[PDB]
Structure 1
Amino acid sequence: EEIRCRKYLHPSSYTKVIHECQQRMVADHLQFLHAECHNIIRQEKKNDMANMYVLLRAVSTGLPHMIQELQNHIHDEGLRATSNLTQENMPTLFVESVLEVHGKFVQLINTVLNGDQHFMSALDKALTSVVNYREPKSVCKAPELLAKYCDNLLKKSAKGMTENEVEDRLTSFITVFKYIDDKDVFQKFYARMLAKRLIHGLSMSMDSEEAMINKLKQACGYEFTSKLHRMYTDMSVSADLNNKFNNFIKNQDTVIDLGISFQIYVLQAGAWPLTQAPSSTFAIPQELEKSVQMFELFYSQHFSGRKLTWLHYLCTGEVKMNYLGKPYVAMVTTYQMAVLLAFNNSETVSYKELQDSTQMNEKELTKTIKSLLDVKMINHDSEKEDIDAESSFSLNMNFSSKRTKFKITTSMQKDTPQEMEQTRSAVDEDRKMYLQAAIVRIMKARKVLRHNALIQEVISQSRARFNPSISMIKKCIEVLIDKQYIERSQASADEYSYV
């Protein structure tokens, strides 16, 4: 008909005729096409799908049903390809499944459906729905899985994970990362495991970590990768700072031979999540108190206005066990530096002999003691192996180390599952405070709002980092009620008035 009206009609009638060729042939049978449209998408018949698209595009109200059907098909395919995974390499398989679904449907839309941006938006919505697929009355697992995927691929291991493929795998990972919609959880988890990967030297490549930081920056603005970039820069600058301290000590008038090698990793307290919750008054030994006080003097002299907060649960060392006739060398953790110093003077010690040498809570003492009882540096003098009031301890003379470099902190590099829920609670309270601030700002600014509208206003500003639930923001409202920030209006409970 386009050819026929080309060689039989005036130019002004080229379009109208074909319009009447459509409204009587494709529009009038929309109910026939749309009812078949669902069956076109599920079996993925590209030959029929392209013709259905180029037909329904002319009709005013034909495209949106096809868009909705494609979105539903993509969502169902994503659930089928992602919901059957069970552990093993689940963080990698989830990302690979979402990447494969996205890659299949992008080329399906581009090659077949003209590369239409409406179907691209439908694909984006379907992938947002499948990525954030959480079990009913449960917690979403997508940010944890993606963060574990990054941690698994970016760690140093001899599994053949070459460098020349990571920097292009991460560009593909950004595609699934853009659909998280819960980016606060991923940011916190990636910050924690980035701290673990950088402190212990588990990062396979510093430049690859910096590539991660820049990719997340390009994905979610600068403020997303603020703490992460400060972490990376601190770890990069720490070597130069150690080199500076290497000649600061020789530049003093009196050559103070400390007797130890110093490899301080000085870090920003406002970026790293390393928080010492209890008091835990560490009794620094005589071989380290001079070093720590002289380093404190160094910052009090060189980097003015920089308060130091020494935490001892990320630092390690090596102590010469000369009482056992040198059975190789061992790498050990700092909290039991006290535990083993009292054994230097007296062979047999107890809780009374160790309380005056440690001076902190019993929770730290019990776990640090069990860290040595199980690995058999310290044996129990009496039969009562369980923790009691006296609990006499002795150094194991008979036991000898076998491995040349004996490491007791393997337990250290294991992201225990129990701390995962602690980080989840930390994220929960962080977003609770963020929503508190958001409601205070909006309520102070506007001075009048409705119950159904205040939630929408809060979502409008809180969409940047996470998805606020309607039930949990309801609980947030009573928190402002308790803090006399808001109360229900006298005329109706729907309205709110600032006080």
Structure 2
Amino acid sequence: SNLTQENMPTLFVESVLEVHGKFVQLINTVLNGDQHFMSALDKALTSVVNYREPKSVCKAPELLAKYCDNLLKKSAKGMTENEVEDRLTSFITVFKYIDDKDVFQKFYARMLAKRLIHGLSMSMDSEEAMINKLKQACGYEFTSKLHRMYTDMSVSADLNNKFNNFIKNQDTVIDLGISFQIYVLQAGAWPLTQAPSSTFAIPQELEKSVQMFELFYSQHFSGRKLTWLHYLCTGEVKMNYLGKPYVAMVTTYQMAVLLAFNNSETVSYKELQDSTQMNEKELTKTIKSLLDVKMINHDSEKEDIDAESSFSLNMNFSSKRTKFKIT
């Protein structure tokens, strides 16, 4: 109740370890580790995370999935093998108290699929040790969906090593930027399914490479139509207007907007609706994120988002490193 429902993902884990840690030693020393008092401590702790004072019962499995996203976040570099390995051991003990295992599985499925497509995977060992702790506690049936998602990413990793060797076999007008980022998805193992998007136009820079991926994937499976997901896939850009050529990994939705600036310095709202080739409901959320940053700046004194307002292009962008993640 000291934090009500605004609990932090790094503070909720330490709050449980401090309460349980001060009681796991008072019983094993004074009471000589009696089995009667040990069962009462685990039974009473299960009702704390399930029946609390604030009216926020669904926030317990959400904070548990958010804690794994911070340890697996890849901003630019990485982490050591001592603090991450020691924090994963104390995480399986807190999960034994929360009885809402069905809500945690739905939150972890959509979070793991987003960290792989966006490229936010920092340590591969954090994903292997996570599915192993859930199998030893819950069982092999509950961790069956998580094991299929990890094995599917390992198959695409082995395919990237074979496609990388093809560059040394007659290839000189292909090497330019980043290499393959194949993320094989399924219909039952993965939460994302083959659903119609919003008939995107696809920028002219992304016309190649992806075209060769459809013909390469058609050789392994006899007839397999693939659909792209522009909501989780991100690209990259190179700005040569500052003192250092910075690279910012932007979303593929912003690439179609920046491609329209090659004809004129400014692009109105009526011309941006035809270049993106989509509805106005999706362009509103896209132009909103570009206005808060230093990518698209307004003119005059104070210009809001309107149907007749223009949108200029700003060369100065807030950067500091190369290939920085925005999610």
- Give the TM-score range, shorter chain: 0.7 to 0.9
Q: Give the CA deviation at 1:216.
A: 1.0
* Structure-2 change in CA distance of 1:191 and 1:304 (3 Å): same
* Distance in 2 separating the partners of 1:160 and 1:321: 25
Give unmatched runs, 5+ long, in structure 2. Answer: none
Structure 1 length-normalised TM: 0.54
Secondary structure, counterpart of 1:180 in structure 2:
coil
**Residues 1:282 and 1:131: Cα distance change in structure 2 (over 3 Å):** same
Deviation at 1:302, TM superposition (A): 2.1
> CA 1:239 to 1:400, structure 2 compared with 1: closer, same or farther past 3 Å?
same
How far apart are residue 283 of structure 1 and its match? Answer: 0.7
Q: C-alpha offsets along residues 68-88 of structure 1, whole Å, 9 cap, x if unaligned?
A: xxxxxxxxxxxxxxx435799
Could you tell me how far 1:310 is from its partner in structure 2? Answer: 0.8
325-334 or 290-299: bigger deviation:
325-334
Residues 99/397 of structure 1: CA separation in 2 closer, same or farther (3 Å cut): closer
Among residues 363, 368, 387, which one is paired with 2:281 in the alignment? 363
CA 1:344–1:211 in 2, change beyond 3 Å: closer, same or farther?
Answer: same
Residue 108 (structure 1) shift: 3.9
Shift in CA distance, 346/88, structure 1 to aligned 2, threshold 3 Å: same
- Work out the CA distance in 2 between the residues paired with 1:126 and 1:342: 61
For 1:268-323, what per-residue CA distance to the aligned partner results, in whole angstroms no more than 9, with x for missing partners?
A: 35344457987322111233223223211111112345442210222222334568
What corresponds to 2:6 in structure 1?
88
Q: CA offset at residue 101 of structure 1?
A: 3.7
The residue that corresponds to 2:215 in the other structure is 297
Q: Whole-Å Cα distance in 1 between the matches of residues 25 and 321 of structure 2? A: 55
Partners of 1:285 and 1:158 lie apart in 2 by 27
Whether the aligned pair in 2 keeps the contact of 1:380 and 1:394 (CA below 8 Å) is yes
Give the superposed CA RMSD. 4.9
Rounded Cα–Cα distance in structure 2 between residues aligned with 1:102 and 1:369: 48
Say which of 150, 166, 185 aligns to 2:103.
185
Overall identity of the aligned pairs, in % = 100
Question: Do 1:99 and 1:173's aligned partners in 2 also have CA atoms closer than 8 Å?
Answer: no
Q: CA, structure 1 residues 247+227, in 2 after alignment: closer, same or farther (shift >3 Å)? A: same
- Greater CA drift, 349-358 or 291-300: 349-358
For each residue in 1:197-256, what CA deviation from the matched residue of structure 2 results, as whole angstroms up to 9, or x when unmatched? 444454443113211110012111223323333333344443322223334577799987
Q: 1:116 to 1:397 in 2, by over 3 A?
A: closer
Report the CA distance between 1:335 and its aligned residue.
0.5
Q: Using the alignment, how far apart are the partners of 2:310 and 2:192 within structure 1?
A: 34
SS of residue matched to 2:192: coil
* 1:198 has 2:198 as partner: no
1:371/1:100 CA distance change after superposition, 3 Å: closer
Q: Once the 2 structures are TM-superposed, how far is the Cα of residue 163 of structure 1 from its aligned partner?
A: 1.9
Change (3 A) 1:159 1:91: farther
Cα distance change of structure 1 residues 338 and 276 upon mapping to structure 2, 3 Å threshold: farther
| Contact 1:327/1:402 (<8 A) preserved | no
Residues in 2 aligned to 1:402 and 1:347: alpha-carbon distance in whole angstroms: 25
Farther off after superposition, 323-332 or 194-203: 323-332
Q: CA deviation at 1:127?
A: 1.1
* Contact 2:115–2:121 (CA under 8 A) maintained in structure 1: yes
CA 1:134/1:259 → structure 2, altered by over 3 Å: closer, same or farther? closer
Structure with the higher helix share, 1 or 2? 1
- Indicate how the Cα distance of structure 1 residues 258 and 250 shifts in structure 2: closer, same or farther if over 3 A, else same: farther
Distance in 2, matches of 1:304 and 1:252, equals 27
Cα deviation, residue 396, structure 1: 3.5
Q: What residue in structure 2 maps to residue 261 of structure 1? A: 179
- Supply the distance in 2 between the matched residues of 1:402 and 1:93 (Cα, whole angstroms): 30
Whether 2:39 is the aligned partner of 1:117: answer no
**What CA distance in whole angstroms lies between the structure 2 residues aligned with 1:335 and 1:268?**
24
Once the two structures are TM-superposed, the CA of residue 325 in structure 1 deviates from its matched residue by: 10
* Equivalent of 2:50 in 88, 110, 132: 132
CA deviation vs aligned residue, 1:375-409 (integer Å, no higher than 9, x gap): 2333446677222223323333688977776776x
Cα distance in 2 between the residues matched to 1:300 and 1:95: 47
Contact 2:74–2:121 (8 Å) recurs in 1? yes
Structure 1 pair 381/119, CA: closer, same or farther in 2 (3 Å)?
closer
CA distance in 2, matches of 1:137, 1:325: 52
Which residue number corresponds to residue 217 of structure 1? 135
| Per-residue Cα deviation, 1:4-49 (whole angstroms, up to 9, x for no partner) | xxxxxxxxxxxxxxxxxxxxxxxxxxxxxxxxxxxxxxxxxxxxxx
- 239-248 or 281-290, which moves further after superposition? 239-248
**Is contact 1:167-1:211 (8 Å) kept?**
no
Q: 1:108 to 1:158 in 2, by over 3 A?
A: farther
The CA distance in 2 between the partners of 1:131 and 1:159, in whole Å, is: 35
Aligned length: 327
Report the secondary structure of 1:393's partner residue: strand
1:183, distance to aligned residue in structure 2 (A):
1.1
State yes or no: 1:156 paired with 2:74. yes
TM-score scaled to structure 2, two decimals? Answer: 0.79
Q: Is 1:319–1:330's contact at 8 Å kept on the other side of the alignment?
A: yes
Conserved 8 A contact 1:384-1:391: no
SS at structure 2 position matched to 1:96? helix
**Does the C-alpha gap of structure 1 residues 209 and 188 become closer, same or farther in structure 2, counting only changes over 3 Å?**
same
How far apart are the structure 1 equivalents of 2:193 and 2:281? 17
Conserved in 1, the CA contact under 8 Å of 2:268 and 2:309?
yes
Distance 1:169 1:378, change over 3 A: closer
Change beyond 3 A, Cα 1:86–1:162: farther
**Which stretch shows the higher mean deviation, 183-192 or 85-94?**
85-94
Question: Retained in 2: the 8 A contact 1:98–1:176?
Answer: yes
Rg larger in structure? 1
State the alpha-carbon separation in 1 of the partners of residues 177 and 29 from structure 2: 69
Q: How far apart, CA to CA, are the structure 2 residues paired with 1:157 and 1:400?
A: 15
Structure 1 unmatched runs, 5+: 1-82, 409-498
